[PDB]
Amino acid sequence: PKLPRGLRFGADNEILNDFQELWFPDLFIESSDTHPWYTLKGRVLNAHLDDRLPNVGGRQVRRTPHRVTVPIASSGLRPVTTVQYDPAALSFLLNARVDWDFGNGDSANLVINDFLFRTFAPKEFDFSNSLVPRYTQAFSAFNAKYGTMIGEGLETIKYLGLLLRRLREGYRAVKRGDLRALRRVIQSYHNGKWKPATAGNLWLEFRYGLMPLFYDIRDVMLDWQNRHDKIQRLLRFSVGHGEDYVVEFDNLYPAVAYFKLKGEITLERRHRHGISYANREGYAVFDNGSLRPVSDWKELATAFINPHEVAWELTPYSFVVDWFLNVGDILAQQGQLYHNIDIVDGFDRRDIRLKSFTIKGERNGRPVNVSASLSAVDLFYSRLHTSNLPFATLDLDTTFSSFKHVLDSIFLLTQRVKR
Amino acid sequence: AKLETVTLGNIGKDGKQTLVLNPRGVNPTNGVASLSQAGAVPALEKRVTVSVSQPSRNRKNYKVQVKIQNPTACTANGSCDPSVTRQAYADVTFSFTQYSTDEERAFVRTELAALLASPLLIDAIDQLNPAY
Amino acid sequence: AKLETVTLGNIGKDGKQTLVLNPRGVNPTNGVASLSQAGAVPALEKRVTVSVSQPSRNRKNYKVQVKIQNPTACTANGSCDPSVTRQAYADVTFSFTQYSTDEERAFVRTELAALLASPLLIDAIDQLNPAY
Amino acid sequence: AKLETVTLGNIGKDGKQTLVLNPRGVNPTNGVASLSQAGAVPALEKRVTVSVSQPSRNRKNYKVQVKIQNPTACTANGSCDPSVTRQAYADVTFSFTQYSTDEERAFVRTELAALLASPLLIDAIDQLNPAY
Amino acid sequence: AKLETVTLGNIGKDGKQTLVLNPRGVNPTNGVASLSQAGAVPALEKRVTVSVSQPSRNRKNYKVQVKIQNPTACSVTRQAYADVTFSFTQYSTDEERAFVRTELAALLASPLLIDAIDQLNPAY
Amino acid sequence: AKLETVTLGNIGKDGKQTLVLNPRGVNPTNGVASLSQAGAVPALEKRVTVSVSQPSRNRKNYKVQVKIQNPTACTANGSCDPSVTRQAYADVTFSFTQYSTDEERAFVRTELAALLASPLLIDAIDQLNPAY
Amino acid sequence: AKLETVTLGNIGKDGKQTLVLNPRGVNPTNGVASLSQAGAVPALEKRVTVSVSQPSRNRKNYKVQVKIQNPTACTANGSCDPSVTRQAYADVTFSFTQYSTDEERAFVRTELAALLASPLLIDAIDQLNPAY
């Protein structure tokens, strides 16, 4: 009651998504008239008619209420919502201008507005046989289509870990206290036998004496963020197939049995399916109230290169240890993106959309001429969540366990840094 | 906590008056729900605001702010509508952590509610007398 | 504004507990009186501070302050001394002009009380729910 | 669009009052036709300004500005005639493309008129209730 | 100021057509409510935005703004739009505000402004 | 190591603006200092980085570099976060032979200062005009 | 800027010295000014060049280049004719965004002109105080 319909509380009073309502909502019937009136303006058989009578007789559609979700992952992926709108009969307004000049004194010319008609809706259809095949091949080529980027990401993250380890060595040298031994890393960048000039200082030979290290760190962590972005974008596979289905509308008489209206309506129905992947443990209970942003990822990288920093003259130790700790925090946060990755969500959607139409008036010798434009009011749209996946999936846990291992190791390394 | 007509019954010195704050809306730019007593002059009405700040990345602490404003009439012997002369303000900001608990939240609420009625704060605000 | 023991009853979610805060020493450093749980250790845990800053250069505009603090503490399975795991606190303020009148001051008091009793603030506070 | 006596019928809250703005003239320096409430003290009259800004090589856009001001009398209890105390301004700015059609232009016209008659803007301006 | 479906009848050059404006999300970046045509596509075409900016360090002086936008296509080939800004002081009264609203409506329905909008002719 | 506060004056065309630059640190790699305005915002804080080099192997002449940033700090930007829109770069570079003199350095120094102060460089730096 | 005799002041290291700079003509082949003092040989004379560029296919900024070359002329002990022995650079580059204003432009100019007189630049240039 406190939270909106599609939400619920957790153990420690944390915002969470109510699956029972998300995937199994309470349908309800509705018969809310939208345009239960039509207006004819003009003259027919020398009779100016401008009445306004109703057109809608009875409505009935089942649908679901309004819901709210919240991302259940660091990347911000939201869960899918079960929705239904399956009108018993379709609806399409026709703002046509019927007119026809017949002999023996018989002319008609007027314009119709807010005139709709109900017709059958082909709900019974299933393209599973056509959609299921279009996953296996995609998965098989996946590794052949992105193994390159996954491998370069795996090496980039290990390179980040190596950089952080070298930085940790330098910091530990700083903490223990030594000017000459502190140059262990300094010799790892100059590519040359650098000689001293005078008596230096600990913080002086560490604040920017490691500019190549800082530049490398910034560059390759931006590199990893960029690849990361794509990689998590790569954890989703949506595919759909569309076909055309022409339909006929029953006869109708906008006037009082003065002229008949017939023709055809062109629609297409497309069946779509989308599979997703994420953690299989914390997906149900993902703390959205305590997470770090994504900007601090750039913040930490640029901090050491920032030539504006007063904490180097007040508390170097605190600032550098906080740098470590926040890096480890972000690392652990992104770690959950690769722990036990399996099918977590799945939706199947069936939707109908008009494309074209045709109109033909026939009362006596095909006297009517129609030049109208069609527009729909009600379209069949049914999107249901499903958990049964009757086909071989692409379980991407084994191919990501390495990344999880790497991030855990790096977090251990950085949390091992003490004041 | 949906908005609706709030009617404070007995309030005041002798405890006889009542207040009816009608539902204005919620400024969404800052997530602030507002309530006003029935009138016409925006400058001559008792107003109340309630706001609910979730733990930001730079804060990590739940906040509830509740404000009350009451302006004086000092209506003049003619010459136009009254003029705002004095403005009584009250502000309360409650604060907890993420693993906060309903019970001690209501506890602090009721503690302050009964403090406001105890004789200490009575003459502390009433007569402006330093707590002594 | 005499200092003494205050026993506030009908406290909490269902309004059944009671808190007895006994007086303390009025802070010379800033002229602020203090009340605390009957004790013993809770005497240095729970706090209720009350102050009334008079008109000044910064203050014009009397300023009344009330800060309530409740530290939740726990004992680990093996420890002895209780360590504070959480800290509750709320802060009420009333800023009143030099020509303010005591009737309206008490009106403000009682209005804030009746609102804190109103379901709206208990919902937004105890349950931490924006009014929507 | 010749200037002449404009008599706007029922207007206000209850829809009972009528307004009679006499035709004054046209400022040429900006091409602005002016409509004025029948009165004596130029500070005590409801005013309207109609400007038909044709397109140039800096904007290539037709414009209509219609501005309306109402001043408040706030008659003082003697000592001399009233002083301007409050002043309500309204400014409508139709921005047409040169290719515009009389049809679209009238659509915009009656559209804004109906919106200003509908309950939404009724409360959004009369009661200054934010759209929510 | 509840947001709901608005049925504007008797509009146009001869006051015959009707506009059905359903509400949308109130823009949280600046607190502005929106209404759009019944749809489907015209929803993202036609727009009516409403905001009531309360006083601030630059306002004082409430400012109620109503913007209307009509794009005409056949790709949007033309775009008409209008903007109304009422500035009201804090001591202003709802009497004043309804007077102003009703006066502006009666002006837009008066012959002069139909002449100056529809055919775009200055009062001469 | 430069740790001196510089109280500048005669800023802008009017000459009535003043500025103050407080040291922020030293970059123990290239002999660079850092100075900033009092504040907590990049756009509102003006940067001054001086740098002095000595011959090692790549060059046989000194280098005195000076980089000043005067970002344009905009007030209204959708919130109380003054951002930058126009970054004002000012880069100065010197090169002195190891057999030069403090006299020669002061000579170039004062000639630069005088040309900057004269109406010669003002027309080319502000109004952007060529040498007619 | 413009070809004219620019009467400088305070050159070298004292407030009494001055210097006059007459133009030498502009070169249409490149478009770079030249000013210097009465003489015949540039080595014996003191040169200042300025250059201004506007947005084009090369860049998108308003580049103002300034150079001041005061080479040391030796006319004895070996080189009989005036030979340049010590060369000193004065490359000052001003860059600004397309949407910058005159005051943005003059801010950096005043910054640099008064910094060159400030004590930081004086001992950074003349005495070459290290900035390690």
mmCIF file with all atom_site columns, C-alpha atoms in Angstrom, chain F residues 1-2 4 6 8-13 19 21 26-33 35 46 48 50 52-54 62 64 66 68 70 72 85-97 99-100 102 104-132, chain G residues 1-4 6-13 19 21 26 33 35 46-48 50 52-54 62 64 66 68 70-72 85-97 99-132:
data_model
loop_
_atom_site.group_PDB
_atom_site.id
_atom_site.type_symbol
_atom_site.label_atom_id
_atom_site.label_alt_id
_atom_site.label_comp_id
_atom_site.label_asym_id
_atom_site.label_entity_id
_atom_site.label_seq_id
_atom_site.pdbx_PDB_ins_code
_atom_site.Cartn_x
_atom_site.Cartn_y
_atom_site.Cartn_z
_atom_site.occupancy
_atom_site.B_iso_or_equiv
_atom_site.pdbx_formal_charge
_atom_site.auth_seq_id
_atom_site.auth_comp_id
_atom_site.auth_asym_id
_atom_site.auth_atom_id
_atom_site.pdbx_PDB_model_num
ATOM 1   C CA . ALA F 1 1   ? 58.970 25.588 -4.327  1.00 0.00 ? 1   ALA F CA 1
ATOM 2   C CA . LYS F 1 2   ? 56.503 28.475 -4.624  1.00 0.00 ? 2   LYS F CA 1
ATOM 3   C CA . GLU F 1 4   ? 53.334 32.643 -1.875  1.00 0.00 ? 4   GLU F CA 1
ATOM 4   C CA . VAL F 1 6   ? 49.656 36.858 -4.911  1.00 0.00 ? 6   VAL F CA 1
ATOM 5   C CA . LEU F 1 8   ? 46.601 40.853 -8.070  1.00 0.00 ? 8   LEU F CA 1
ATOM 6   C CA . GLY F 1 9   ? 44.888 44.095 -9.082  1.00 0.00 ? 9   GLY F CA 1
ATOM 7   C CA . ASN F 1 10  ? 43.667 46.184 -11.998 1.00 0.00 ? 10  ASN F CA 1
ATOM 8   C CA . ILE F 1 11  ? 41.849 43.290 -13.678 1.00 0.00 ? 11  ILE F CA 1
ATOM 9   C CA . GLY F 1 12  ? 39.700 43.868 -16.732 1.00 0.00 ? 12  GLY F CA 1
ATOM 10  C CA . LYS F 1 13  ? 39.261 46.936 -18.891 1.00 0.00 ? 13  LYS F CA 1
ATOM 11  C CA . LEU F 1 19  ? 41.989 38.766 -7.666  1.00 0.00 ? 19  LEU F CA 1
ATOM 12  C CA . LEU F 1 21  ? 45.908 33.495 -5.892  1.00 0.00 ? 21  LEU F CA 1
ATOM 13  C CA . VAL F 1 26  ? 54.062 21.757 -6.294  1.00 0.00 ? 26  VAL F CA 1
ATOM 14  C CA . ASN F 1 27  ? 54.554 19.098 -8.958  1.00 0.00 ? 27  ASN F CA 1
ATOM 15  C CA . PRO F 1 28  ? 57.884 17.432 -8.117  1.00 0.00 ? 28  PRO F CA 1
ATOM 16  C CA . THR F 1 29  ? 58.570 16.276 -11.681 1.00 0.00 ? 29  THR F CA 1
ATOM 17  C CA . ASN F 1 30  ? 59.031 19.317 -13.926 1.00 0.00 ? 30  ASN F CA 1
ATOM 18  C CA . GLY F 1 31  ? 59.535 22.105 -11.409 1.00 0.00 ? 31  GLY F CA 1
ATOM 19  C CA . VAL F 1 32  ? 55.965 23.371 -11.561 1.00 0.00 ? 32  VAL F CA 1
ATOM 20  C CA . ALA F 1 33  ? 53.982 25.258 -8.933  1.00 0.00 ? 33  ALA F CA 1
ATOM 21  C CA . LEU F 1 35  ? 48.043 28.747 -7.593  1.00 0.00 ? 35  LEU F CA 1
ATOM 22  C CA . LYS F 1 46  ? 41.365 30.758 -11.926 1.00 0.00 ? 46  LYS F CA 1
ATOM 23  C CA . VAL F 1 48  ? 48.080 29.850 -12.574 1.00 0.00 ? 48  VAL F CA 1
ATOM 24  C CA . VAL F 1 50  ? 54.399 28.517 -13.382 1.00 0.00 ? 50  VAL F CA 1
ATOM 25  C CA . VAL F 1 52  ? 60.970 26.511 -14.453 1.00 0.00 ? 52  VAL F CA 1
ATOM 26  C CA . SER F 1 53  ? 63.321 24.020 -16.112 1.00 0.00 ? 53  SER F CA 1
ATOM 27  C CA . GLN F 1 54  ? 67.067 23.446 -16.140 1.00 0.00 ? 54  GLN F CA 1
ATOM 28  C CA . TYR F 1 62  ? 66.235 27.336 -19.776 1.00 0.00 ? 62  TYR F CA 1
ATOM 29  C CA . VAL F 1 64  ? 60.051 29.441 -18.004 1.00 0.00 ? 64  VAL F CA 1
ATOM 30  C CA . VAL F 1 66  ? 53.344 30.001 -17.461 1.00 0.00 ? 66  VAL F CA 1
ATOM 31  C CA . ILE F 1 68  ? 46.817 30.671 -16.830 1.00 0.00 ? 68  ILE F CA 1
ATOM 32  C CA . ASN F 1 70  ? 40.387 32.010 -16.655 1.00 0.00 ? 70  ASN F CA 1
ATOM 33  C CA . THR F 1 72  ? 33.962 31.714 -17.673 1.00 0.00 ? 72  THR F CA 1
ATOM 34  C CA . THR F 1 85  ? 31.340 27.491 -21.067 1.00 0.00 ? 85  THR F CA 1
ATOM 35  C CA . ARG F 1 86  ? 34.411 29.387 -22.332 1.00 0.00 ? 86  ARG F CA 1
ATOM 36  C CA . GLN F 1 87  ? 37.861 28.201 -21.273 1.00 0.00 ? 87  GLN F CA 1
ATOM 37  C CA . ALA F 1 88  ? 40.386 31.049 -21.299 1.00 0.00 ? 88  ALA F CA 1
ATOM 38  C CA . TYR F 1 89  ? 43.831 29.701 -22.199 1.00 0.00 ? 89  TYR F CA 1
ATOM 39  C CA . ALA F 1 90  ? 46.893 31.892 -21.678 1.00 0.00 ? 90  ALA F CA 1
ATOM 40  C CA . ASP F 1 91  ? 50.187 30.167 -22.479 1.00 0.00 ? 91  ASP F CA 1
ATOM 41  C CA . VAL F 1 92  ? 53.561 31.919 -22.110 1.00 0.00 ? 92  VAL F CA 1
ATOM 42  C CA . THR F 1 93  ? 56.895 30.264 -22.891 1.00 0.00 ? 93  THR F CA 1
ATOM 43  C CA . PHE F 1 94  ? 60.450 31.567 -22.499 1.00 0.00 ? 94  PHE F CA 1
ATOM 44  C CA . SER F 1 95  ? 63.883 30.285 -23.533 1.00 0.00 ? 95  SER F CA 1
ATOM 45  C CA . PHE F 1 96  ? 67.089 31.757 -22.122 1.00 0.00 ? 96  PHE F CA 1
ATOM 46  C CA . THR F 1 97  ? 70.648 30.854 -22.995 1.00 0.00 ? 97  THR F CA 1
ATOM 47  C CA . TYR F 1 99  ? 75.071 32.515 -20.584 1.00 0.00 ? 99  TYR F CA 1
ATOM 48  C CA . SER F 1 100 ? 72.309 35.117 -20.366 1.00 0.00 ? 100 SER F CA 1
ATOM 49  C CA . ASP F 1 102 ? 69.464 38.510 -14.781 1.00 0.00 ? 102 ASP F CA 1
ATOM 50  C CA . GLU F 1 104 ? 68.644 40.468 -19.801 1.00 0.00 ? 104 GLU F CA 1
ATOM 51  C CA . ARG F 1 105 ? 65.857 38.418 -18.217 1.00 0.00 ? 105 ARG F CA 1
ATOM 52  C CA . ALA F 1 106 ? 64.544 41.480 -16.381 1.00 0.00 ? 106 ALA F CA 1
ATOM 53  C CA . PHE F 1 107 ? 64.781 43.408 -19.651 1.00 0.00 ? 107 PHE F CA 1
ATOM 54  C CA . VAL F 1 108 ? 62.518 40.973 -21.501 1.00 0.00 ? 108 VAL F CA 1
ATOM 55  C CA . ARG F 1 109 ? 60.312 40.752 -18.401 1.00 0.00 ? 109 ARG F CA 1
ATOM 56  C CA . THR F 1 110 ? 59.689 44.481 -18.176 1.00 0.00 ? 110 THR F CA 1
ATOM 57  C CA . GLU F 1 111 ? 59.311 44.857 -21.945 1.00 0.00 ? 111 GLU F CA 1
ATOM 58  C CA . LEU F 1 112 ? 56.614 42.168 -21.900 1.00 0.00 ? 112 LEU F CA 1
ATOM 59  C CA . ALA F 1 113 ? 54.859 43.844 -18.973 1.00 0.00 ? 113 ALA F CA 1
ATOM 60  C CA . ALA F 1 114 ? 54.935 47.273 -20.615 1.00 0.00 ? 114 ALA F CA 1
ATOM 61  C CA . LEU F 1 115 ? 53.671 45.989 -23.959 1.00 0.00 ? 115 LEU F CA 1
ATOM 62  C CA . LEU F 1 116 ? 50.843 44.183 -22.175 1.00 0.00 ? 116 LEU F CA 1
ATOM 63  C CA . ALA F 1 117 ? 49.959 47.341 -20.238 1.00 0.00 ? 117 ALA F CA 1
ATOM 64  C CA . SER F 1 118 ? 50.148 49.619 -23.300 1.00 0.00 ? 118 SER F CA 1
ATOM 65  C CA . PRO F 1 119 ? 47.250 50.014 -25.770 1.00 0.00 ? 119 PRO F CA 1
ATOM 66  C CA . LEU F 1 120 ? 49.278 48.044 -28.346 1.00 0.00 ? 120 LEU F CA 1
ATOM 67  C CA . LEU F 1 121 ? 48.431 44.462 -27.361 1.00 0.00 ? 121 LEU F CA 1
ATOM 68  C CA . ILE F 1 122 ? 45.009 45.337 -25.930 1.00 0.00 ? 122 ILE F CA 1
ATOM 69  C CA . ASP F 1 123 ? 43.578 45.939 -29.414 1.00 0.00 ? 123 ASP F CA 1
ATOM 70  C CA . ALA F 1 124 ? 44.918 42.627 -30.765 1.00 0.00 ? 124 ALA F CA 1
ATOM 71  C CA . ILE F 1 125 ? 43.955 40.511 -27.744 1.00 0.00 ? 125 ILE F CA 1
ATOM 72  C CA . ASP F 1 126 ? 40.506 41.975 -26.994 1.00 0.00 ? 126 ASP F CA 1
ATOM 73  C CA . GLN F 1 127 ? 39.158 43.546 -30.181 1.00 0.00 ? 127 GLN F CA 1
ATOM 74  C CA . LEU F 1 128 ? 41.060 41.113 -32.433 1.00 0.00 ? 128 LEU F CA 1
ATOM 75  C CA . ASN F 1 129 ? 42.409 43.436 -35.130 1.00 0.00 ? 129 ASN F CA 1
ATOM 76  C CA . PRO F 1 130 ? 45.388 43.055 -37.491 1.00 0.00 ? 130 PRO F CA 1
ATOM 77  C CA . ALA F 1 131 ? 48.279 45.503 -37.891 1.00 0.00 ? 131 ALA F CA 1
ATOM 78  C CA . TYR F 1 132 ? 46.908 48.039 -40.371 1.00 0.00 ? 132 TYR F CA 1
ATOM 79  C CA . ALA G 1 1   ? 46.896 46.118 -33.623 1.00 0.00 ? 1   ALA G CA 1
ATOM 80  C CA . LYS G 1 2   ? 48.127 49.219 -35.446 1.00 0.00 ? 2   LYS G CA 1
ATOM 81  C CA . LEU G 1 3   ? 51.442 50.701 -36.568 1.00 0.00 ? 3   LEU G CA 1
ATOM 82  C CA . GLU G 1 4   ? 52.317 53.465 -34.107 1.00 0.00 ? 4   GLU G CA 1
ATOM 83  C CA . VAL G 1 6   ? 54.313 52.865 -28.473 1.00 0.00 ? 6   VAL G CA 1
ATOM 84  C CA . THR G 1 7   ? 55.860 54.696 -25.511 1.00 0.00 ? 7   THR G CA 1
ATOM 85  C CA . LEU G 1 8   ? 56.601 52.009 -22.936 1.00 0.00 ? 8   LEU G CA 1
ATOM 86  C CA . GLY G 1 9   ? 57.621 52.583 -19.334 1.00 0.00 ? 9   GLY G CA 1
ATOM 87  C CA . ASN G 1 10  ? 59.581 50.836 -16.599 1.00 0.00 ? 10  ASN G CA 1
ATOM 88  C CA . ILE G 1 11  ? 61.944 48.654 -18.667 1.00 0.00 ? 11  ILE G CA 1
ATOM 89  C CA . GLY G 1 12  ? 64.885 46.708 -17.302 1.00 0.00 ? 12  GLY G CA 1
ATOM 90  C CA . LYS G 1 13  ? 64.531 46.750 -13.526 1.00 0.00 ? 13  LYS G CA 1
ATOM 91  C CA . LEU G 1 19  ? 61.609 52.750 -24.260 1.00 0.00 ? 19  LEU G CA 1
ATOM 92  C CA . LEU G 1 21  ? 58.952 51.388 -30.224 1.00 0.00 ? 21  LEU G CA 1
ATOM 93  C CA . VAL G 1 26  ? 53.866 44.760 -42.023 1.00 0.00 ? 26  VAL G CA 1
ATOM 94  C CA . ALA G 1 33  ? 53.777 43.088 -37.386 1.00 0.00 ? 33  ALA G CA 1
ATOM 95  C CA . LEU G 1 35  ? 58.077 47.195 -33.851 1.00 0.00 ? 35  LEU G CA 1
ATOM 96  C CA . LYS G 1 46  ? 64.974 45.222 -29.950 1.00 0.00 ? 46  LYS G CA 1
ATOM 97  C CA . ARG G 1 47  ? 62.131 43.536 -31.820 1.00 0.00 ? 47  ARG G CA 1
ATOM 98  C CA . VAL G 1 48  ? 58.509 42.778 -30.969 1.00 0.00 ? 48  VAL G CA 1
ATOM 99  C CA . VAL G 1 50  ? 52.402 40.394 -33.055 1.00 0.00 ? 50  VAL G CA 1
ATOM 100 C CA . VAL G 1 52  ? 46.289 37.702 -35.137 1.00 0.00 ? 52  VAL G CA 1
ATOM 101 C CA . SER G 1 53  ? 44.293 34.927 -36.807 1.00 0.00 ? 53  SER G CA 1
ATOM 102 C CA . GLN G 1 54  ? 40.563 34.305 -37.172 1.00 0.00 ? 54  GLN G CA 1
ATOM 103 C CA . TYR G 1 62  ? 41.030 33.518 -32.145 1.00 0.00 ? 62  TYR G CA 1
ATOM 104 C CA . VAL G 1 64  ? 46.853 36.014 -30.838 1.00 0.00 ? 64  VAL G CA 1
ATOM 105 C CA . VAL G 1 66  ? 53.155 37.648 -29.562 1.00 0.00 ? 66  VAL G CA 1
ATOM 106 C CA . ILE G 1 68  ? 59.667 39.609 -28.428 1.00 0.00 ? 68  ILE G CA 1
ATOM 107 C CA . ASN G 1 70  ? 66.073 40.935 -27.951 1.00 0.00 ? 70  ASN G CA 1
ATOM 108 C CA . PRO G 1 71  ? 69.154 39.048 -29.139 1.00 0.00 ? 71  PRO G CA 1
ATOM 109 C CA . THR G 1 72  ? 72.492 40.041 -27.650 1.00 0.00 ? 72  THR G CA 1
ATOM 110 C CA . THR G 1 85  ? 75.231 35.531 -29.096 1.00 0.00 ? 85  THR G CA 1
ATOM 111 C CA . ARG G 1 86  ? 72.384 35.033 -26.582 1.00 0.00 ? 86  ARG G CA 1
ATOM 112 C CA . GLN G 1 87  ? 68.814 34.634 -27.868 1.00 0.00 ? 87  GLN G CA 1
ATOM 113 C CA . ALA G 1 88  ? 65.736 35.000 -25.649 1.00 0.00 ? 88  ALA G CA 1
ATOM 114 C CA . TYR G 1 89  ? 62.215 33.863 -26.573 1.00 0.00 ? 89  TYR G CA 1
ATOM 115 C CA . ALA G 1 90  ? 58.947 35.530 -25.559 1.00 0.00 ? 90  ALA G CA 1
ATOM 116 C CA . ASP G 1 91  ? 56.260 33.341 -27.143 1.00 0.00 ? 91  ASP G CA 1
ATOM 117 C CA . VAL G 1 92  ? 52.897 34.384 -25.665 1.00 0.00 ? 92  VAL G CA 1
ATOM 118 C CA . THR G 1 93  ? 49.847 32.637 -27.124 1.00 0.00 ? 93  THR G CA 1
ATOM 119 C CA . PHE G 1 94  ? 46.253 33.702 -26.490 1.00 0.00 ? 94  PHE G CA 1
ATOM 120 C CA . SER G 1 95  ? 43.461 31.325 -27.502 1.00 0.00 ? 95  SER G CA 1
ATOM 121 C CA . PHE G 1 96  ? 39.732 31.793 -26.946 1.00 0.00 ? 96  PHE G CA 1
ATOM 122 C CA . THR G 1 97  ? 36.451 30.182 -27.910 1.00 0.00 ? 97  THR G CA 1
ATOM 123 C CA . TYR G 1 99  ? 31.609 32.544 -28.170 1.00 0.00 ? 99  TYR G CA 1
ATOM 124 C CA . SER G 1 100 ? 33.968 34.524 -25.910 1.00 0.00 ? 100 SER G CA 1
ATOM 125 C CA . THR G 1 101 ? 33.625 38.182 -24.971 1.00 0.00 ? 101 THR G CA 1
ATOM 126 C CA . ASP G 1 102 ? 35.974 41.120 -24.692 1.00 0.00 ? 102 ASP G CA 1
ATOM 127 C CA . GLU G 1 103 ? 36.175 40.941 -20.903 1.00 0.00 ? 103 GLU G CA 1
ATOM 128 C CA . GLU G 1 104 ? 37.075 37.259 -21.034 1.00 0.00 ? 104 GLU G CA 1
ATOM 129 C CA . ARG G 1 105 ? 39.833 38.345 -23.416 1.00 0.00 ? 105 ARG G CA 1
ATOM 130 C CA . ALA G 1 106 ? 41.166 41.171 -21.230 1.00 0.00 ? 106 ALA G CA 1
ATOM 131 C CA . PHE G 1 107 ? 41.032 39.114 -18.020 1.00 0.00 ? 107 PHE G CA 1
ATOM 132 C CA . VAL G 1 108 ? 44.032 36.984 -19.042 1.00 0.00 ? 108 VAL G CA 1
ATOM 133 C CA . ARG G 1 109 ? 45.869 40.078 -20.325 1.00 0.00 ? 109 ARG G CA 1
ATOM 134 C CA . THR G 1 110 ? 45.615 41.869 -16.983 1.00 0.00 ? 110 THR G CA 1
ATOM 135 C CA . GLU G 1 111 ? 46.447 38.588 -15.237 1.00 0.00 ? 111 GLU G CA 1
ATOM 136 C CA . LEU G 1 112 ? 49.730 38.266 -17.110 1.00 0.00 ? 112 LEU G CA 1
ATOM 137 C CA . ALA G 1 113 ? 50.685 41.955 -17.090 1.00 0.00 ? 113 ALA G CA 1
ATOM 138 C CA . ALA G 1 114 ? 50.379 42.225 -13.317 1.00 0.00 ? 114 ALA G CA 1
ATOM 139 C CA . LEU G 1 115 ? 51.840 38.770 -12.694 1.00 0.00 ? 115 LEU G CA 1
ATOM 140 C CA . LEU G 1 116 ? 54.994 39.802 -14.551 1.00 0.00 ? 116 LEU G CA 1
ATOM 141 C CA . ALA G 1 117 ? 55.291 42.594 -11.972 1.00 0.00 ? 117 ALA G CA 1
ATOM 142 C CA . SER G 1 118 ? 54.301 40.342 -9.058  1.00 0.00 ? 118 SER G CA 1
ATOM 143 C CA . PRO G 1 119 ? 57.186 38.838 -7.051  1.00 0.00 ? 119 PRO G CA 1
ATOM 144 C CA . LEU G 1 120 ? 56.542 35.257 -8.182  1.00 0.00 ? 120 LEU G CA 1
ATOM 145 C CA . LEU G 1 121 ? 57.387 35.740 -11.851 1.00 0.00 ? 121 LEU G CA 1
ATOM 146 C CA . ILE G 1 122 ? 60.189 38.187 -11.019 1.00 0.00 ? 122 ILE G CA 1
ATOM 147 C CA . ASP G 1 123 ? 62.230 35.661 -9.041  1.00 0.00 ? 123 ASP G CA 1
ATOM 148 C CA . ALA G 1 124 ? 61.037 32.800 -11.260 1.00 0.00 ? 124 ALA G CA 1
ATOM 149 C CA . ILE G 1 125 ? 62.556 34.538 -14.310 1.00 0.00 ? 125 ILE G CA 1
ATOM 150 C CA . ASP G 1 126 ? 65.339 36.807 -13.091 1.00 0.00 ? 126 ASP G CA 1
ATOM 151 C CA . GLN G 1 127 ? 66.608 34.729 -10.159 1.00 0.00 ? 127 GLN G CA 1
ATOM 152 C CA . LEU G 1 128 ? 65.173 31.471 -11.576 1.00 0.00 ? 128 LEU G CA 1
ATOM 153 C CA . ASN G 1 129 ? 63.763 30.300 -8.272  1.00 0.00 ? 129 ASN G CA 1
ATOM 154 C CA . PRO G 1 130 ? 63.286 26.528 -8.697  1.00 0.00 ? 130 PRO G CA 1
ATOM 155 C CA . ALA G 1 131 ? 59.701 25.239 -8.607  1.00 0.00 ? 131 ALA G CA 1
ATOM 156 C CA . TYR G 1 132 ? 60.505 21.613 -7.772  1.00 0.00 ? 132 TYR G CA 1
#
